[PDB]
């Protein structure tokens, strides 16, 4: 992926110009290494949502409610 | 000479002696009802007031 990138940001210097089949495989390779830092974060409850009775909190510890961020 | 000694048991009542005990006081004055309740851990660790 790296020499495929630096190969692509450096053929100009020389007068050149790239193919077809360098690029296809420097787009696998970049996705090959683009799969790896993949992250989908997921997104928390509101803070606001009520909790669900059936949780059993407790009145005075502030449990009814979701701690949302922080 | 009798040796009668098994005829006994070492007994250990169900008793305890008293204790060593402290002072509250710092605590009773100190004003508890500016911050009753106004920091979760759950929002944060922090809380602000403001000046006059």
């Known amino acids: ?70 | 000479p009798n040796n009668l000694d098994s005829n006994v048991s070492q007994i250990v009542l169900k008793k305890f002696l008293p204790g060593f005990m402290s002072d509250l006081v710092l605590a009773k004055t100190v004003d508890r009802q500016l911050l009753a309740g106004e920091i979760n851990s759950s929002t944060g660790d922090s809380v602000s007031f403001k000046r006059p």
Do not use: W
């Open chain 1, 1 to 70: 992926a790296v020499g495929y990138q630096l190969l692509l940001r450096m053929l100009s210097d020389y007068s050149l110009e790239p193919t077809p089949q360098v690029l296809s495989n420097a787009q696998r390779s970049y996705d090959a290494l683009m799969t790896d830092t993949l992250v989908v974060p997921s997104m928390r409850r509101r803070g606001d949502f009520p909790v669900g009775q059936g949780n059993k909190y407790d009145v005075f510890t502030s449990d009814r409610y979701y701690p949302g961020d922080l």
